[PDB]
Structures are given as structure tokens and as C-alpha cells.
Amino acid sequence: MIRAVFFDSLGTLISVEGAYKVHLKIMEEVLGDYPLNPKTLLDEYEKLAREAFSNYAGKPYRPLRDILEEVMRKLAEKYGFKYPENLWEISLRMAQRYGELYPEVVEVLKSLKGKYHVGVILNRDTEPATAFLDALGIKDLFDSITTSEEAGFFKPHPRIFELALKKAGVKGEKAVYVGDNPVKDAGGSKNLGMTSILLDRKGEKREFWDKADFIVSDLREVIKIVDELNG
Ligand SMILES: [Mg+2]
Ligand SMILES: [Mg+2]
């Protein structure tokens, strides 16, 4: 029986397009009048952050603030603009102003509440991530919020999923995990016995669909999967 449904954040609850806008607005603020295209700075940021962060996948937790500050330091040195003071605060303000949920999120979360444990798992620092969920208006819709800072390891290390399950009080066999990353989300959660749902909104990850138990393009399909699993 499925008693718990856990959600990834970025690309699952939190819009990738909204995240791009957030990040572009950060770059615009950082640069000011510096004669660099903010979109080009953003493109370079995304490359470095992907690589720097891929080195931490499954590894012991390190504050993401520190990792991203080091990326920005490299970018400032590369392009010649002054390293921005209070970068973290700029980023938090931009995320609260421009971050966006996918349109079905509130409905889906509310539909599961009262029948299942509703959880979110964030590969992030706890205070900023929780304040962002609060700004988007959904912090209190969750029975549990679990983070890499709490578990001590980044996805797909099993500890973050183990902790989420403990908060819900069930073993993995009783839970579903929905995420958009085949290896870090589907593979990671399967390692604890969870039922993995790969969210492929644009149908662009077919070559990785066999890494998950179910594939969906819209979070409204999740409750139908859970209902069927429960008879
Ligand atoms: Mg994601
Ligand atoms: Mg995350």
C-alpha cells in the first residue's frame, strides 16, 4: 500500500522556465552597467554550476551557497566585473520575486493531503529552500520537508531518502518519489525500495524512461498511479 508521496523540487514543483528567469534577473543585477550580455553570463554560469555540482552528487553535503559563490568568483575573474557583495541575498530576493510553480502543483498537493503523507525532498540548504517554498505559498501544504543539509549527503545518496521516509514513518515500499532527473531521482529513490515516477514534461528523456517505474508528463497523473497501486 502507498501511504506517502514525495516530490523533487526543481523541474517537478518549481518551474524550469521560472528558474531561468530568476537566474537571468540575478545576472542582470550582478552586472549592472557592465558591458556583458546577462544571457551569456547565465549560459556560462549554468555550465560551471552543472559541473561543480555534478562533482558533489552522492557526496557529503557542502553548503550550496559556498559552491555557487565559488562559481561566481570564477565568472567575475573571467569576465572582469567586480565580484558582487551579498550575492546570496540578491539571489534570495530574485527567487522570491520571480520563482514560479508549475500550474497544477497546488491542486495536486491539496488532493493528496489527508490521504497520503505529502513530502518534498530538496537537494539544497534548508533555510533558503524553506523560505522559497514559503514565498511560493506551499510550505504548509507538506507533511515533511527534507533536505541534503539535514541528511548530510546530496542526492542520490540514500541517506536523504532514508530521512524522508523516517519522517513519514514508513519504509520505501510504502512510498512514491516523483522527480525529473533519471539517475538522481528515479535511480536514487529506487535504491530504498520506493516506487519511482519520472516526470518528463516535454517528452525529451525517452532514452532514460527505463530507469523509472512510471513516466508522467503532468503531476495530475501521480494520484491516478497511486490510486491504482492501492487497488
Ligand atoms: Mg529536479
Ligand atoms: Mg532539489
- Deposited resolution, Å: 1.7
Please name which ligand lies nearest the alpha carbon of 156: 2
CA of 80 to the centre of ligand 2 (A): 31
- The answer to whether the beta carbons of residues 155 and 59 sit under 8 Å apart is no
State the sign of the Cα–Cα–Cα–Cα dihedral 220, 222, 225, 227: negative
Specify whether 81 is located in the same domain as 119: no
Specify whether 129 is located in the same domain as 190: yes
| Biggest CA pair distance of the chain | 61
- The answer to whether the beta carbons of residues 172 and 189 sit under 8 Å apart is yes
Q: What does the block give as the cell for 206?
A: 525517452
Please name which ligand lies nearest the alpha carbon of 151: 2
CA of 213 to the centre of ligand 1 (A): 17
Instruction: Report d(CA 163, CA 110) in Å as an integer.
Output: 23
CATH number at residue 211: 3.40.50.1000
Number of domains within the chain = 2
Instruction: Report d(CA 204, CA 188) in Å as an integer.
Output: 20
What string of H, E and C letters represents the secondary structure of 3-48? Answer: CEEEECCECCCECHHHHHHHHHHHHHHHHCCCCCCHHHHHHHHHHH
Specify whether 112 is located in the same domain as 182: yes
Q: Which residues contact 69 (CB under 8 A, 6 or more apart)?
A: 87, 88
Instruction: Report d(CA 41, CA 45) in Å as an integer.
Output: 6
Question: Which of residues 98, 124, 148 is at a domain's end?
Answer: 98
CA of 228 to the centre of ligand 2 (A): 27
Q: Among 56, 45, 110, 55, which residue's Cα sits nearest to residue 79?
A: 45
Beta bridge partners of 117: 4
Q: What does the block give as the cell for 169?
A: 514513518
State the sign of the Cα–Cα–Cα–Cα dihedral 191, 158, 188, 174: positive
Specify whether 138 is located in the same domain as 201: yes
CA of 123 to the centre of ligand 2 (A): 4
Distinct helix (H) and strand (E) counts, the chain: 10, 6
Specify whether 159 is located in the same domain as 129: yes
CA of 140 to the centre of ligand 2 (A): 18
Specify whether 74 is located in the same domain as 127: no
156: preceding bond cis by omega (within 30 degrees): yes
Q: Among 13, 60, 58, 20, which residue's Cα sits nearest to residue 42?
A: 20
CA of 9 to the centre of ligand 2 (A): 5
Instruction: Report d(CA 161, CA 167) in Å as an integer.
Output: 10
Taking the alpha carbons at both ends of the chain, their separation in whole angstroms is 9
Q: What does the block give as the cell for 89?
A: 541575498
Question: Is residue 144 within a helix (H) or strand (E), and if so which, with residue range?
Answer: strand 144-147
Instruction: Report d(CA 196, CA 107) in Å as an integer.
Output: 21
Specify whether 167 is located in the same domain as 184: yes
Please name which ligand lies nearest the alpha carbon of 19: 1
| Rg, Å, the chain Cα set | 18
**Residue ranges making up the domain that contains 199:** 4-15+100-229
Q: How were these coordinates obtained?
A: X-ray
Q: Which residues contact 10 (CB under 8 A, 6 or more apart)?
A: 16, 19, 180
What string of H, E and C letters represents the secondary structure of 87-104? Answer: HHHHHHHHHHHHCCECCC
Work out the angle at residue 103's Cα, subtended by the Cα atoms of residues 21 and 39, and round it to the nearest 5 degrees: 10
Specify whether 122 is located in the same domain as 172: yes
Q: Among 92, 49, 89, 56, which residue's Cα sits nearest to residue 73?
A: 49
Instruction: Report d(CA 95, CA 53) in Å as an integer.
Output: 19
Q: What does the block give as the cell for 62?
A: 557542502
Instruction: Report d(CA 224, CA 83) in Å as an integer.
Output: 49
CATH number at residue 69: 1.10.150.240
Specify whether 116 is located in the same domain as 22: no
Q: What does the block give as the cell for 42?
A: 547565465
Ion ligand 2 neighbours (CB, 5 A) are: 9, 122-123
Please name which ligand lies nearest the alpha carbon of 14: 1
Specify whether 107 is located in the same domain as 199: yes
- The answer to whether the beta carbons of residues 117 and 144 sit under 8 Å apart is yes
Percentages helix, strand, coil for the chain, rounded to the nearest 5? 55, 15, 30
